[PDB]
Amino acid sequence: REFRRREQEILDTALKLFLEQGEDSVTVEMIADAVGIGKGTIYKHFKSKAEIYLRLMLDYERDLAALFHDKEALSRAYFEFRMRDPQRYRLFDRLEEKVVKTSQVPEMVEELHKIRASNFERLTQLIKERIADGKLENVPPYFHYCAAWALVHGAVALYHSPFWRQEGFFHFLMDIGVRMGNK
Amino acid sequence: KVREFRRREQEILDTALKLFLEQGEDSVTVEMIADAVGIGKGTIYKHFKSKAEIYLRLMLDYERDLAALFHDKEALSRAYFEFRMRDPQRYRLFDRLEEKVVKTSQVPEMVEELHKIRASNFERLTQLIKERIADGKLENVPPYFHYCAAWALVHGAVALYHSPFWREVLQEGFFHFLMDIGVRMGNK
Numbered sequence: 001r002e003f004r005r006r007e008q009e010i011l012d013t014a015l016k017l018f019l020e021q022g023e024d025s026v027t028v029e030m031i032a033d034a035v036g037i038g039k040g041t042i043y044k045h046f047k048s049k050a051e052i053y054l055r056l057m058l059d060y061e062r063d064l065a066a067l068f069h070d071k072e073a074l075s076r077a078y079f080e081f082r083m084r085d086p087q088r089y090r091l092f093d094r095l096e097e098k099v100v101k102t103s104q105v106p107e108m109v110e111e112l113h114k115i116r117a118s119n120f121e122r123l124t125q126l127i128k129e130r131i132a133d134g135k136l137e138n139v140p141p142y143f144h145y146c147a148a149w150a151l152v153h154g155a156v157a158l159y160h161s162p163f164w165r166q167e168g169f170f171h172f173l174m175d176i177g178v179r180m181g182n183k
Numbered sequence: 184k185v186r187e188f189r190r191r192e193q194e195i196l197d198t199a200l201k202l203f204l205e206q207g208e209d210s211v212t213v214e215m216i217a218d219a220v221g222i223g224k225g226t227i228y229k230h231f232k233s234k235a236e237i238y239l240r241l242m243l244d245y246e247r248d249l250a251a252l253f254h255d256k257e258a259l260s261r262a263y264f265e266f267r268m269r270d271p272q273r274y275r276l277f278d279r280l281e282e283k284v285v286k287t288s289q290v291p292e293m294v295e296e297l298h299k300i301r302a303s304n305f306e307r308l309t310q311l312i313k314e315r316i317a318d319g320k321l322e323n324v325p326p327y328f329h330y331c332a333a334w335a336l337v338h339g340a341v342a343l344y345h346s347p348f349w350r351e352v353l354q355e356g357f358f359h360f361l362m363d364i365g366v367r368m369g370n371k
Binding site: 149176179 | 356360363
């Protein structure tokens with residue numbers, strides 16, 4: 001458990017330092033110095049910094065997979081998962097070109113693509129159900145999840161524009177996604 | 184004489200825009216624009232003294248087009264999202280030129296005007312939202328809840344229209360699906 005605990009403590013501080021100052025800036029030694037562990041004990045978990053990037057994204061899908069385990073309440077919770085903390089989204093967006101596109105450690109890039117596809121396959125099911133219940137305007141479900149993606153992607157860019165300065169607006173965005181494409 | 188000059192300028196404009204899309208703005212020069220039209224090397228300089236001037240002129244006519252658009256409210260809200268999502272690459276190109284010649288005030292006489300119409304166009308769409316709120320169709324929240332969410336749907340759609348997914352979305356029905364979403368988003 002203590003090893004399982006330390007692996008999370010490394011990743012929690014890792015992602016934190018990855019939101020403050022640039023993920024290009026933070027080194028493995030910085031993470032090892034920030035967590036309070038040894039400069040060599042950190043390598044007992046992750047073999048490189050790109051491997052931290054990959055697991056940082058695997059738990060994201062592992063959490064979205066847990067969320068998929070009420071059709072309206074769990075549809076709203078989906079947009080909470082995507083639109084909360086848009087800096088995590090923009091970091092993974094940049095990380096998508098560095099470690100995933102350039103399959104560094106292909107073992108995890110392999111695993112990642114699977115849980116993204118499993119998470120992708122768990123979404124249309126909700127879509128076809130909300131369509132089968134006459135709530136979502138009956139269209140090809142590929143119409144829906146593209147519009148859902150095209151709104152969380154634009155909301156992260158919205159939250160990153162010179163427009164930061166907020167809760168009722170966030171709930172207004174969620175009510176948009178739930179009522180989006182509704183019959 | 185002003186009509187043939189206003190027409191050749193429009194021809195240079197369409198030719199300059201068609202070449203920035205096919206080839207990218209970073210490789211099209213004034214000489215290539217002036218040759219795909221078929222005019223001399225210095226006659227295109229009688230219209231614009233810089234490719235940057237052509238840059239800001241393209242974004243200026245975009246806002247001029249939008250100014251003529253805000254001239255019913257439900258039919259006006261649709262024609263907006265049509266104007267915004269039509270030709271997403273122009274928006275994508277203008278997203279780049281916003282950093283090249285708008286951030287860097289190359290020819291600041293045009294950047295000043297471009298910022299004033301963007302403020303005048305912003306006042307118009309804000310009144311469209313205020314009109315639909317005060318009338319009673321849109322939910323009575325700050326109009327900033329309405330055009331910020333409207334800005335997000337337009338942004339993520341052109342980013343959807345450029346993803347490796349775009350062999351499919353380029354349709355008429357999914358386009359009309361997004362604009363049903365846009366007009367119905369934020370309703371009471």
